[PDB]
Ligand binder design. Structure first.
Ligand SMILES: NC(=O)c1ccc[n+]([C@@H]2O[C@H](COP(=O)([O-])OP(=O)(O)OC[C@H]3O[C@@H](n4cnc5c(N)ncnc54)[C@H](OP(=O)(O)O)[C@@H]3O)[C@@H](O)[C@H]2O)c1
Ligand SMILES: NC(=O)c1ccc[n+]([C@@H]2O[C@H](COP(=O)([O-])OP(=O)(O)OC[C@H]3O[C@@H](n4cnc5c(N)ncnc54)[C@H](OP(=O)(O)O)[C@@H]3O)[C@@H](O)[C@H]2O)c1
Ligand SMILES: NC(=O)c1ccc[n+]([C@@H]2O[C@H](COP(=O)([O-])OP(=O)(O)OC[C@H]3O[C@@H](n4cnc5c(N)ncnc54)[C@H](OP(=O)(O)O)[C@@H]3O)[C@@H](O)[C@H]2O)c1
Ligand SMILES: NC(=O)c1ccc[n+]([C@@H]2O[C@H](COP(=O)([O-])OP(=O)(O)OC[C@H]3O[C@@H](n4cnc5c(N)ncnc54)[C@H](OP(=O)(O)O)[C@@H]3O)[C@@H](O)[C@H]2O)c1
Ligand SMILES: [Mg+2]
Ligand SMILES: [Mg+2]
Ligand SMILES: [Mg+2]
Ligand SMILES: [Mg+2]
Ligand SMILES: [Mg+2]
Ligand SMILES: [Mg+2]
Ligand SMILES: [Mg+2]
Ligand SMILES: [Mg+2]
Lengths: 328, 328, 328, 328
């Protein structure tokens, strides 16, 4: 296990190579803007009737058609949603793949689960930032970066690891640290994390706490500040110092209450479920569920989106974030 | 209930008829090679850019395009995977179906569940061997055959039962015995058998026994011989003599231990599940699940294939079968 | 862990030695006939008022009285049922044991559990085939052999390991592979295997599946072919290629159904019982039960034998195996 | 199903034949005394150092040694305890068995479970009274008889059914009715009956009722009369008229209370246990337990005998039966 950083990487194997960034969404716009910041030879490939095309053009980028970018570039960096990467690849990318070319991703989903089968003679690597695309850029602008994983699925030029290292440094991931792993290990840990802790866990944790107080009769305005707003100020301490830096800044009264009560909230029942969530990922049951959600038309997902927006927490949340000027 | 054999069947209604065997896979190559052995007028219809096409050509068969074989033949025997039979039929078979033609299968899945709707005026029968395709041929080469079922879903020439009987004898199924049944009864018993006993049951049974000993600290090499390898030598006894022939050859110590302990392994809980497995088949819930696995891209199935290959039993299993020369 | 084979064994330490095979039952007749095939100096010791005595005499063997064979031979190979070995040894074998002689078995039951206490100055080894006696011979006739374990409990001539190796090669076990272990490990794994998987497991598995379909209203004749007869053709694939060779020959429909349903048949409850079955063996509770079954007159065992023979599966099983000529 | 009676049986096949009654216990003395009453040619075979020998001699019988009686008689009727019949048969009966002789029992235990294996050429029948031996005689003296079963396990003279019929009529069983059945069906129903209802059931039923009242504080003397003594006067009604004759003589208050409360005493739990008790008999588990009780020395049985005699019900029971003169 070796953690690559700035002093251990170079831009040698990308010095002289054109990189097509297919996409300009969360990560797409983020990574593309950063790569260009480092003085990297980048071309963005977008839809000509799509919205992001006008957005990448205003940002000062060489917007081109996906096919045109695909035919010109040496490296093809695919930054569109996973659920539609299989179609876009087979129709607007696969044809312009010549032996010696490199196909790179930021998530091993489509490769690992077999939705994209690359042709022989082509490099398959991954450069994956472990943060939301908006953070990836903002963290780069401040002079820092976000953690990144490097992976090689197919090495044909014998040059693949260096190529991915070069791109990782450009995106800024080398500032926080870069570790080499496999597509399988990146995809499985990423899905579990987002499901059990990063997106699923915290939201339900905050929701359960907010509604415990509201249904007890306390003000919804107070409940927001105490279960949701104050959370942002706490996690910063962990990010910079871990649990010890947080326990020291917080009062001893808060330290004793949290240490004794937390085993009761995250119980053994929740620990049992986290093990099952991981097994559904490992054996492809979640992927099957997610692929069928898309083929079915996202009725379940869209309905869940609508119910989330009708939560009182989001109403009182939005009203407080606007008056103080935290949300426009 | 009448069990047809060699002395009760004839090749009369197939004497003068061309038979298209669509496919050359497990059963495809098996049944086609046997039918020709009996001096039957067979044509194989394969893909021209596919692999099996070169394989059927080397075997000394009249390889032709599916459409060409379909237009020339009187009988169309479909031996490709069920999940893709619906598309191949509607595009490369249905057009060359003329009134008086016969459409035959070896499994009632696509017919019974409605994925293939034949046109009026056409015979619909089934000739189904109750064994893996590799065994179907090897059993024929030894001078024996495997059990077969005969079924008629649509009789238009009044000749359908004789046609299926003729083909069944050619494949060699008449040596072991042929019983007439319905598509529904063939499909439901076949799926249950393979799921609850033939493929699902034994594998999990062997796995649970292997890992009981390994985790107890005994050698994985010894555990293979005692839970898996010795199983092949035991089932032969049942195949030839049933439970009594096996109980007599095995020691009294093995007879008393198995008779008293087996109710504990296959318990009432497992008996309850076998009843539910059968009801999921009977009401089309398994078929719906299997059709969606394919539309979804087989991510779950392929992931299960990968986890199976990483089992220690398969590693130590493969190493012992190679050194002794049982697997090349 | 070293796996002995043909190229790693020799007949040196048995070249010049007489071997008494006490017994002519399943293993007795099997091993004795094979040892003689290899040009080994074998004498069979049987009862003069017993049936097998006439059977070994017809086979072209030097039938002699157990005592006579015991007094003449250097090696005494005991191939009679375990439950009666203790009496036969103390009365017709122990007296003719001279220092320097070797006492060999094919199962560690009587030695490990203390029912036979050998005298000092005598070699105690084991040559154990991991297959039913009928298979041991048939496998030898085909040019192959069955797996064997080698064990040394007492080495007095410093020659014991070579002696057992010599006999193992003669029986044909060296063709499949020979591994050295202890009496304890041979006896405990053998009993567990036969109880939980080889004899107990499969029979109850097949029974539960057969009766699920029959009580659902499907034909008993069809149920036999689909839960029992087709099993023999499936295990062959595992024997030669493991789970992967079987999954590939079977259809994808059978592969998906078995992979998803098997966890439900062999459940956690069955896994818990397999752990208890192993602990009853390890602490001598099964042996105590089996010894008391014999002292009590085998009323329970014989009653279980009678109920097994009245199963409908065995009736319909026997009728189908006779008409096709698989059972005379 | 034909119920033999007095008008359907004859003493033809026993007219001219000597019958050895081995034993003079409960049934032994009972059946022997009755057979002689009918003018039957009976010899009793007892131990010469045993007690019953002096008792049969005083009763006016031809007491002889078991061997002497065995060598003289044509029919050998074995009326000793089942647990010791196997030894007495092989040592004092088997030698005097000549082809054409008949071996008869009153219980199928030793035959059915294989503790006595008769020689070929000898008749094996059963004449079984369904009542305690004391009742068998007393019922005969009153001019009535007790129900009997007739069974044939081996017919060698073609005369076996007539022989058993002849003896059944002599014992008096033909007055109540004689039904032909198998050894298996006689033994299994007899053991279940005595275990679940006739001896086990009623005693525990009476015990539970007696101690319910005593521990509630009511007089033990009153509790005896109301739960135990009055039972004898109730069953007579059922014996002569069934449930309807009893319900009519008893008060409507007793009829309504018993009809509504009885489902609560004999519940579903007891019904589940009766099914298991029958399965332990059917598969020989009870027989194995009972054979081991004897080999072990009857310590458990004798201890249960001692605890029964220390019950307060038996103390207060005995005191009331003596003062009134019902027990000497
Ligand atoms: N999102 C994260 O924070 C995050 C974190 C780590 C890794 N990743 C991975 O990074 C990759 C990029 O995901 P993302 O969330 O950033 O994507 P995204 O925002 O969901 O995708 C938006 C972009 O995709 C384009 N697009 C959508 N459908 C298209 C189609 N049919 N043809 C062509 N272009 C199409 C859009 O163009 P138009 O304007 O024309 O519609 C737009 O440029 C994924 O593999 C994801 O797993 C994401
Ligand atoms: N497998 C058994 O042991 C078994 C037992 C009883 C009954 N059955 C039944 O027998 C039938 C045959 O199954 P199977 O397992 O033997 O088939 P299979 O081996 O899975 O199918 C392989 C064959 O299908 C061809 N094929 C695949 N996709 C095709 C496509 N899109 N167009 C044209 N040809 C295509 C392949 O040709 P290429 O070389 O060109 O790819 C190859 O010849 C099924 O209905 C099954 O349920 C099977
Ligand atoms: N059976 C297997 O497949 C298997 C697999 C591995 C290991 N083993 C082990 O191999 C050993 C041999 O078992 P086995 O099953 O092959 O034996 P078996 O068939 O049950 O024994 C039959 C033989 O024992 C003789 N015999 C029975 N009672 C006798 C007595 N009182 N005195 C003398 N000879 C007597 C019989 O002679 P008569 O003809 O005179 O009656 C006959 O020759 C055991 O230790 C067993 O655990 C067996
Ligand atoms: N008991 C019933 O009500 C009843 C109901 C139906 C059927 N049966 C069946 O009828 C049969 C007779 O049973 P039972 O209860 O009447 O017998 P039992 O009273 O228990 O046996 C007593 C008799 O057995 C003799 N005896 C005991 N041990 C002996 C030995 N070692 N050698 C020779 N004689 C010996 C005694 O002779 P000594 O005086 O010398 O000791 C005495 O004559 C059994 O098969 C039973 O199952 C009984
Ligand atoms: Mg992530
Ligand atoms: Mg993600
Ligand atoms: Mg099948
Ligand atoms: Mg199938
Ligand atoms: Mg074994
Ligand atoms: Mg064994
Ligand atoms: Mg009785
Ligand atoms: Mg009784």
């Amino acid at each position: 296990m070796k953690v690559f950083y700035d002093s251990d990487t170079t831009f040698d194997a990308v010095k002289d190579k054109t990189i097509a960034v297919i996409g300009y969404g969360s990560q797409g716009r983020a990574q593309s803007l950063n790569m260009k910041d480092s003085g990297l030879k980048v071309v963005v490939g977008l839809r000509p009737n799509g919205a992001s095309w006008n957005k990448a053009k205003e940002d000062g980028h060489e917007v081109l058609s996906i096919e045109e970018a695909a035919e010109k570039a040496d490296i093809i960096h695919i930054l569109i949603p996973d659920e539609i990467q299989g179609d876009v690849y087979n129709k607007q990318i696969k044809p312009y793949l010549k032996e010696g070319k490199t196909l790179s991703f930021s998530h091993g989903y489509n490769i690992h689960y077999g939705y994209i089968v690359p042709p022989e003679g082509v490099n398959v690597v991954m450069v994956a930032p472990k943060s939301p695309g908006a953070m990836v850029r903002r963290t780069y602008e401040e002079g820092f970066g976000v953690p990144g994983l490097v992976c090689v699925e197919k090495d044909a030029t014998g040059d693949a690891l260096d190529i991915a290292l070069g791109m990782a440094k450009g995106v800024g991931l080398t500032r926080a640290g870069v570790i080499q792993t496999t597509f399988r290990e990146e995809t499985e840990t990423d899905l579990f994390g987002e499901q059990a802790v990063l997106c699923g866990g915290v939201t339900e944790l905050i929701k359960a706490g907010f509604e415990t107080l509201v249904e007890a009769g306390y003000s919804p305005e107070m409940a927001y500040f105490e279960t949701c707003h104050e959370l942002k100020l706490i996690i910063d301490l962990i990010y910079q110092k871990g649990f010890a830096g947080m326990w020291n800044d917080v009062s001893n009264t808060a330290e004793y209450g949290g240490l004794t009560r937390r085993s009761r909230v995250i119980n053994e029942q929740s620990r049992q479920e986290m093990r099952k969530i991981l097994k559904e990922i490992q054996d492809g049951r979640f992927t099957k569920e997610w692929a069928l959600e898309n083929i079915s038309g996202k009725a379940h997902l869209n309905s869940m989106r609508r119910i989330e927006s009708e939560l009182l927490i989001e109403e009182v949340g939005a009203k407080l974030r606007k008056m103080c000027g935290l949300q426009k």
